Design a protein around this ligand. Structure first.
Ligand SMILES: C[C@]12CCC(=O)C[C@@H]1CC[C@@H]1[C@@H]2CC[C@]2(C)[C@@H](O)CC[C@@H]12
Ligand SMILES: C[C@]12CCC(=O)C[C@@H]1CC[C@@H]1[C@@H]2CC[C@]2(C)[C@@H](O)CC[C@@H]12
Lengths: 177, 177
């Protein structure tokens, strides 16, 4: 695994890494990574501009991707795609195209959430945070709670536009797989 | 094709068949059929209790399933699953399990819409209409318009609970494939 990190360190409460982005600079509105796990439930990543009313989470529930999103346009809890909890490395891409959010798993589009978002460079609070392996609000506050810690590995990740990233923080040291 | 019917007769404005169901009798809250088409866009079926604010549509957009749903709990436009416009027969099942609506394509769950519905036998207007191959309101009134007529075939269909069906109507004669 090209430098692979564990998505949760121990209890799986908080994220392993939080990155902050300036939306006025953002061009690339997509993210991509490889994930490996035997765990059927947990958070893969979370993103927000506001943890009360403009947020997004991607995780697994019953082995399969689940997206939760709450913003001015849309509030939803959706599962889609094949199980990913077979301990093999899977390529995932989450992209915003027009007003849609698309999820691709192993080269195939498995979900398209249409009419869920107005442009990034036009939007309100112009800072976006991306949290890897945990949420930035309690799990009990999701639309549909899940147990946050995902026991899996993450590698070959790229988050939004690196030229728009303002800062990156880890709350502890990141362990390798 | 065990008695297969065309999903649109000519212009594709109106449905080929409309069935009406008594929700106080409903037990089976699922529907299933096989579909065949080369057409990448159109309506497969529509259902409602109220065409202003409690309705559902399943069709194809860009070859792939798309669900549109508008009710008291949820308003959404979602694409998911593989392309079905390869002129092969595909098995589709749409089921309500708890508060979710699940779509299965060729034996695989490809979409789970969670937290979208309160029970049927508990719900408001206790008549549900299911329209095959068209809508019961203009297409321009969908959340996201599509051209309604789907040029495909439908066979081996079963809609909700036949012991709860109150009446069935066709606006013209149904043609075979
Ligand atoms: C999925 C996106 C866009 C695609 C991506 O790379 C990740 C990122 C996660 C945060 C989401 C964002 C789309 C727009 C959302 C949903 C905002 O409304 C609030 C959080 C944002
Ligand atoms: C998908 C369901 C439930 C499953 C099925 O067999 C078809 C049917 C189509 C009408 C939908 C219904 C679920 C509940 C909905 C979405 C109601 O709120 C209004 C229309 C109903």
């Amino acid at each position: 695994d090209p430098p692979a990190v564990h998505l949760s360190n121990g209890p799986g409460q908080e994220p392993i890494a939080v990155m902050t982005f300036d939306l006025t600079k953002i061009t690339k509105t997509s993210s991509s990574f490889e994930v490996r796990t035997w765990d059927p439930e947990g958070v893969i990543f979370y993103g927000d501009t506001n943890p009360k009313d403009d947020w997004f989470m991607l995780g697994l529930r019953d082995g399969r991707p689940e997206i939760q999103l709450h913003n001015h346009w849309a509030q939803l809890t959706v599962g889609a795609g094949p199980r990913l909890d077979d301990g093999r490395w899977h390529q995932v891409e989450v992209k915003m195209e027009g007003d849609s959010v698309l999820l691709e798993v192993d080269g195939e589009e498995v979900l398209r959430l249409r009419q869920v978002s107005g442009p990034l460079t036009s939007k309100r609070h112009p800072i976006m945070r991306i949290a890897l392996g945990g949420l930035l609000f309690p799990a009990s506050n999701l639309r549909l709670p899940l147990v946050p810690a995902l026991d899996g590995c993450l590698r070959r990740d790229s988050w939004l536009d690196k030229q728009a990233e303002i800062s990156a923080s880890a709350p502890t040291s990141l362990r390798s797989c």
